[PDB]
Amino acid sequence: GIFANCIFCLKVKYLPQQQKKKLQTDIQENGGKFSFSLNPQCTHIILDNADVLSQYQLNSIQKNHVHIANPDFIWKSIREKRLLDVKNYDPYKP
């Protein structure tokens, strides 16, 4: 699937439960894996609008070349049936 070899850290605490679950299944069903923890193996971190990241987390992300994206990265990639440009979904670089 389109998320082959992607490992997503999910920081989406403030999404409705149904949406959290849909993000997970969208990821799993299309070749990806997800965690709730941020570690060197993450390729991406998905961050809903109400969540924030510490400086520690941001340093880790930079160090490990992790892509920061909003949930629309997942939703719209699934919709277009194609992995989109994650650079268009960065809550820190609009």
Author numbering: 4 to 97
Could you share sentences copied from the article?
We identified PARP4 lysine residues K23, K24, K31, and K36 as potentially important due to their vicinity to lysine residues important for PARP1 BRCT binding to DNA. The structures superimposed with an RMSD of 4.3 Å (comparing 74 Cα atoms) and indicated that K23 and K31 in PARP4 approximate the position of DNA polymerase μ residues that are crucial for DNA binding. We mutated lysine residues to glutamines to remove the positive charge that might interact with the negative charge on RNA/DNA, while likely maintaining the local structure by keeping a polar residue in place. We determined X-ray structures of the four PARP4 BRCT domain mutants. As expected from thermal stability analysis, the overall BRCT fold was not affected by the different mutations, and superposition of the mutant structures with WT BRCT yielded RMSD values between 0.5 and 0.8 Å (comparing all 763–788 atoms). The K31Q mutant influenced the local surface charge at the K31 position, but also influenced the placement and charge location of the K24 sidechain. The K31Q mutant showed a stronger binding deficiency with an estimated KD value of 3 ± 1 μM. The K31Q mutant showed a greater deficiency with a KD estimated at 61 ± 12 μM, and the K23/24Q mutant showed no apparent interaction. The TM of WT BRCT was measured as 51.6 °C ± 0.2 deg, whereas TM values of 54.7 °C ± 0.4 deg, 54.3 °C ± 1 deg, 58 °C ± 1 deg, and 60.0 °C ± 0.7 deg were obtained for BRCT mutants F39A, F39Q, K31Q, and K23/24Q, respectively. The mutations resulted in perturbations to electropositive regions of the BRCT surface that are expected to engage nucleic acid.
pmcPARP4 is an ADP-ribosyltransferase (ART) that uses NAD+ as substrate to add ADP-ribose onto target proteins, a process called mono(ADP-ribosylation) or MARylation. PARP4 is also referred to as vault PARP since it can localize to the vault particle, a cytoplasmic ribonucleoprotein complex. PARP4 has a distinct domain composition relative to other PARP enzymes; however, the N-terminal region of PARP4 is homologous to a collection of domains found in PARP1, a regulator of multiple nuclear processes including the cellular response to DNA damage. Collectively, the study establishes the human PARP4 BRCT as a nucleic acid–binding module.
